[PDB]
Design an enzyme around this catalytic site. Structure first.
Site, PDB file in Angstrom:
ATOM      1  N   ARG A  55     -47.050  39.335  66.301  1.00  0.00           N
ATOM      2  CA  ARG A  55     -47.457  40.003  65.053  1.00  0.00           C
ATOM      3  C   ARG A  55     -48.956  39.763  64.850  1.00  0.00           C
ATOM      4  NH1 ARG A  55     -46.303  39.254  58.764  1.00  0.00           N
ATOM      5  NH2 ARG A  55     -46.001  41.474  58.181  1.00  0.00           N
ATOM      6  N   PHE A  60     -56.045  39.989  58.569  1.00  0.00           N
ATOM      7  CA  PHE A  60     -55.084  39.029  58.080  1.00  0.00           C
ATOM      8  C   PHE A  60     -54.877  37.853  59.025  1.00  0.00           C
ATOM      9  CE2 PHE A  60     -50.311  38.766  56.525  1.00  0.00           C
ATOM     10  CZ  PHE A  60     -50.496  37.456  56.070  1.00  0.00           C
ATOM     11  N   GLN A  63     -50.133  35.979  64.680  1.00  0.00           N
ATOM     12  CA  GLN A  63     -49.011  34.993  64.659  1.00  0.00           C
ATOM     13  C   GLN A  63     -48.369  34.939  66.060  1.00  0.00           C
ATOM     14  OE1 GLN A  63     -46.544  34.700  61.239  1.00  0.00           O
ATOM     15  NE2 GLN A  63     -44.695  34.223  62.391  1.00  0.00           N
ATOM     16  N   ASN A 102     -43.475  29.752  58.523  1.00  0.00           N
ATOM     17  CA  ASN A 102     -42.179  29.178  58.078  1.00  0.00           C
ATOM     18  C   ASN A 102     -41.274  30.234  57.445  1.00  0.00           C
ATOM     19  OD1 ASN A 102     -42.545  29.195  55.093  1.00  0.00           O
ATOM     20  ND2 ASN A 102     -44.104  27.660  55.477  1.00  0.00           N
ATOM     21  N   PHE A 113     -49.922  30.647  62.958  1.00  0.00           N
ATOM     22  CA  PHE A 113     -50.789  31.771  62.861  1.00  0.00           C
ATOM     23  C   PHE A 113     -52.261  31.337  62.793  1.00  0.00           C
ATOM     24  CE2 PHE A 113     -51.611  31.600  58.242  1.00  0.00           C
ATOM     25  CZ  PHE A 113     -50.507  30.929  57.821  1.00  0.00           C
ATOM     26  N   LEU A 122     -51.604  31.525  50.448  1.00  0.00           N
ATOM     27  CA  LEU A 122     -50.753  30.641  51.277  1.00  0.00           C
ATOM     28  C   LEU A 122     -50.910  29.110  51.058  1.00  0.00           C
ATOM     29  CD1 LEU A 122     -50.961  32.687  54.559  1.00  0.00           C
ATOM     30  CD2 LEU A 122     -49.248  32.818  52.725  1.00  0.00           C
ATOM     31  N   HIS A 126     -47.898  26.892  53.249  1.00  0.00           N
ATOM     32  CA  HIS A 126     -47.970  26.797  54.713  1.00  0.00           C
ATOM     33  C   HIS A 126     -48.898  25.635  54.981  1.00  0.00           C
ATOM     34  CE1 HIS A 126     -45.976  30.603  55.655  1.00  0.00           C
ATOM     35  NE2 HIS A 126     -46.415  30.932  54.443  1.00  0.00           N
TER      36      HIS A 126
END
Ligand SMILES: Nc1ccncc1N
Length: 165
Positions: A55, A60, A63, A102, A113, A122, A126
């Protein structure tokens, strides 16, 4: 005493792209840093070598690290399937931050990521555990293969990985 360094050698449809190295903040999150390090060397008999960045969303993140289901639904840590959120000392401050993916509180495994933007929302959700040291250019090149929904236009793999020093 000295934060360890790890490297990924990236390929694009089997073709070498370049190397990304990372400082892991063992000084601040030793349990999480040691999981990523060990999965990088493969010293426990499993890990990141050969896995893919499944991904990639430009502006952004990138991942990866699902070496059991290859698509965002798997992975496992060196401590068991899951391990707890170690702490939230470090924040998602901008491009190059390394953080754990997660599926709820206390569900860390092997997925992670690399941010390519500040991802402040986040913070406290995370665990941040490292940052890109060299090869941000290579991360940017990776990011060009992603899309809005995260599907990559070429297969982005970790052809090799391990520890520097
Ligand atoms: N098991 C997981 C599923 C989705 N994201 C992260 C993890 N660790």
């Amino acid at each position: 005493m000295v934060n360890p360094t790890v490297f990924f050698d990236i390929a694009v449809d089997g073709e070498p792209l370049g190397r990304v190295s990372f400082e892991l903040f063992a000084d601040k999150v030793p349990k999480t840093a040691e999981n990523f390090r060990a999965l990088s060397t493969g010293e426990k008999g499993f890990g990141y070598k050969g896995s893919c960045f499944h991904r990639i969303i430009p502006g952004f993140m990138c991942q990866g690290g699902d070496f059991t289901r290859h698509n965002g639904t798997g992975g496992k840590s060196i401590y068991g399937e899951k391990f707890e959120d170690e702490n939230f000392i470090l924040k998602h401050t901008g491009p190059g931050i390394l953080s754990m993916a997660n599926a709820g509180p206390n569900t860390n495994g092997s997925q992670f990521f690399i941010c390519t933007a500040k991802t402040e929302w986040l913070d406290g959700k995370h665990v941040v555990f490292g940052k890109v040291k060299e090869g941000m250019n290579i991360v940017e090149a990776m990011e060009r293969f992603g899309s809005r929904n995260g599907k990559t236009s070429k297969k982005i793999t970790i052809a090799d990985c391990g520890q520097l020093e």
